[PDB]
Structure 1
Amino acid sequence: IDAFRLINANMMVLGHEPRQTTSNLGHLNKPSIQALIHGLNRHYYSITINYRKNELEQKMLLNLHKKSWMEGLTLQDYVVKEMLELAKNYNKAVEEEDKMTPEQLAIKNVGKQDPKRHLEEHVDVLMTSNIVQCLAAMLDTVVFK
């Protein structure tokens, strides 16, 4: 979003420094990077734009935001295990190349720069994915009784 106040050559009698409250045009001054606009420091000084405390709508955008975007009525997910089948074949099929890194840790004395750390991205996928598999295992004894 962008906005500008056209100063003119009539007001060059006074200096072009309102300044009266500062750090608002100090933080509007914080970017000051647009190519021909930086150039157009002559004739132009921008205005400050905050966003309004919109909780009279940010409240209801929040309540429709999360009342909407997670399974709606939320009796929808409570797909489960062929995703895991495919995900378990993922989560074995990367495991041999995930375990090439301890071979890549077998430098004996020292011969290596930054460890090339592929430790993660396969911990946590199993972690939250099989949290989903075990509460997914709960959903029979949660839905039924």
Structure 2
Amino acid sequence: IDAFRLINANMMVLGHEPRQTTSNLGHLNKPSIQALIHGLNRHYYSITINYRKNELEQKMLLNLHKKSWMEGLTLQDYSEHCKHNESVVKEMLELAKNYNKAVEEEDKMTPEQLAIKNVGKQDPKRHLEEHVDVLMTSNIVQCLAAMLDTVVFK
């Protein structure tokens, strides 16, 4: 979205947009080249647009558009979930075997240059605990929902 406003021909050999003592002009857009190839800047000028952001509307749009009450303590229970815990450990075993391979290698082939000639979008720490964090968060939210539901209901 952008708003524009036409200029006259009286200052046509002079500098149009007669702007003065302020410093909020360099923001909100620089003149883009898909827009300045046409009538910018010797035909109109660009203007600044912000939003009248208000309360009594902002939270009632936020909380009412994205909301789910009983979803926070559902289970998606176990037959879909123990299978997921079954799967991730298996390649993480081979990821640990690939983690062994670089550690027992440990050669002075200028190891910062040995690592850049062995780039593979792979193990060292990136393909590491990222999976372990997902294995951590999935089982904690699964078990905390399991223990609270035994507590609350009778």
Give the TM-score normalised by the residue count of structure 2.
0.52
Whole-angstrom CA distance in 2 between matches of 1:47 and 1:120? 49
Over residues 71-129 of structure 1, what are the superposed CA-to-partner deviations in whole Å (9 max), with x where a residue is unaligned? 49999999999999999999999999999999999999999999473124312211221
Q: Which residue of 2 aligns with 1:63?
A: 63
C-alpha change, 1:19 and 1:104, in structure 2 (3 Å) is closer
Give the TM-score normalised by the residue count of structure 1.
0.55
C-alpha change, 1:96 and 1:137, in structure 2 (3 Å) is farther
Report the CA distance between 1:134 and its aligned residue.
1.3
Q: Which moved more, 1:25-34 or 1:122-131?
A: 25-34
Give yes or no for contact 2:73–2:145 (8 Å, CA) kept in 1: no
Give yes or no for contact 1:71–1:77 (8 Å, CA) kept in 2: no
Match of 2:99 among 90, 94, 100: 90
Q: Which moved more, 1:134-143 or 1:8-17?
A: 8-17
Whole-angstrom CA distance in 1 between matches of 2:17 and 2:46? 12
List alignment gaps of at least 5 residues for structure 2: 79-87
C-alpha change, 1:46 and 1:106, in structure 2 (3 Å) is closer
Whole-angstrom CA distance in 2 between matches of 1:89 and 1:114? 7
List alignment gaps of at least 5 residues for structure 1: none
Asked which structure has the greater RCO (Cα within 8 Å, sep 6+), the reply is: 2
Give yes or no for contact 1:91–1:126 (8 Å, CA) kept in 2: no
Q: Which moved more, 1:77-86 or 1:66-75?
A: 77-86
Over residues 4-25 of structure 1, what are the superposed CA-to-partner deviations in whole Å (9 max), with x where a residue is unaligned? 2222333436532433353332
Count residues with an aligned counterpart. Answer: 145
Q: Secondary structure at the match of 1:96?
A: coil
Give yes or no for contact 2:6–2:45 (8 Å, CA) kept in 1: yes
Q: Which residue of 1 aligns with 2:143?
A: 134
Give yes or no for contact 1:98–1:119 (8 Å, CA) kept in 2: no
Whole-angstrom CA distance in 1 between matches of 2:93 and 2:153? 23
